[PDB]
Amino acid sequence: ADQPSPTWGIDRIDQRNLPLDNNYHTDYDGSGVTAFVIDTGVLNTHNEFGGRASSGYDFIDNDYDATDCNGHGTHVAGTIGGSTYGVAKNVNVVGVRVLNCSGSGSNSGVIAGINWVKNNASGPAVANMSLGGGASQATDDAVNAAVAAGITFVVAAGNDNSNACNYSPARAADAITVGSTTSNDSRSSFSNYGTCLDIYAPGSSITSSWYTSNSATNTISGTSMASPHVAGVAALYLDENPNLSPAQVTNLLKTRATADKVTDAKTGSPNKLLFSLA
């Protein structure tokens, strides 16, 4: 399929070179794959999802209603799997709410959400974590264990304009850690960087769904916006080949990535820009 006039992020990922061609081509769509969005919740009824979004668990309220009262998780989820704004337009979306209405949460609750995905994922699965905090081996262990259990984890590098290795789950060995770029292929000014990164993806001024109505959109910036582009492409690859392990997904992302495009990428950063096609 070819989507004309896509938002810039997804426009960027299906081509090697600028300028943007105002087209988002897909050969796959994330069919048969589930993307777990560990975040502020998801507005399941948003027009973007067409029924494909449902609640996993809410660790803020302690119940099964993982609706979004912040917006962040809905935006992240639309980048992964929205009809208009999304990479993988037929993926299943499951909200795992670990962040409150103000976008905050405890290490304990985030770990609870990671474990929940590990224990509940069935079939080809990817999990996205557009969130981070101070270095935590407890958090890293939970991520690494969920990955060892067969779920590809994709996480934001963080918005500190610093070495991403200082933060969890960014530094977690088996996380795919995602830095942010702009529409001219610069590292975003806020993007964390360095050897704990695996890949770069569009993260500045990304348009996607928002929680205020079933048709609402928002345009926001962050490694939190870059992460779901990568999670969405993992879902494409797992539709294409449902037999890939997380390690094989990681390798395929890296071998398929566009090389040597990111300017000001910083010492130790992999100069790899997300590429969605096979």
Binding site, annotated residues for Ca(2+): 11, 14, 21, 23
Binding residue positions = 11, 14, 21, 23
Position among 3, 7, 9, 14 found at the interface with Ca ion (CB under 5 A): 14
Q: Does 31 contact Ca ion by CB under 5 A?
A: no
55 counts as catalytic: no
- Rounded to a whole number of angstroms, the minimum distance from the CB of residue 224 to Ca ion is 22
The residues in 219-248 that bind Ca ion, with binding defined as CB under 5 A, are none
Among 8, 15, 55, 190, binds Ca ion (CB under 5 A): 15
How many angstroms separate the CA atoms of 159 and 246, rounded? Answer: 25
**SS3 category, 277:** coil
- Which residues, numbered 149-168, are part of the site for Ca ion (CB under 5 A)? none
Q: Considering all CA atoms of the chain, what is the largest pairwise distance in Å, rounded to the nearest integer?
A: 47
- In 41-67, which positions are buried (b, 16+ CB within 10 angstroms) versus exposed (e)? bbbbebebbeebbebbbbbbeeeeebb
Hey, is 29 helix, strand or coil? coil
Nearest residue (CB) to Ca ion, 21 versus 264: 21
Catalytic residue (choose from 208, 224, 227, 276): 224
106 is catalytic: no
The count of residues in the chain is 278
Could you tell me which stretch among 22-30, 80-88, 109-117, 251-259 binds Ca ion (CB under 5 A)?
22-30
Does 54 help bind Ca ion (rule: CB under 5 A)? no
21 binds Ca ion (CB under 5 A): yes
Q: Is 174 in the site for Ca ion (CB under 5 A)?
A: no
Report the SS3 class of residue 134: strand
Give me the catalytic one of 29, 39, 185, 239.
39
In the structure encoding, which two tokens stand for residue 274, read together? 């997300």
Return the residue of 23, 115, 166, 271 that touches Ca ion, per CB under 5 A: 23
Min CB(14)–Ca ion separation in Å: 5
Q: How far apart are the first and last CA of the chain?
A: 14
18 burial via Cβ count (<10 Å: 0-12, 13-18, 19+): exposed
What is the token pair recorded at 82?
A: 């929205």
The count of residues interacting with Ca ion (CB under 5 A) is 5
Q: Is 58 in the site for Ca ion (CB under 5 A)?
A: no
- Of 3, 11, 33, 196, the one binding Ca ion by CB under 5 A: 11
Beta pairing, strands 258-259 & 272-273: antiparallel
d(CA 15, CA 47): 27
Residues that bind Ca ion (CB under 5 A): 11, 14-15, 21, 23
Which residues are part of the catalytic machinery? 39, 72, 224
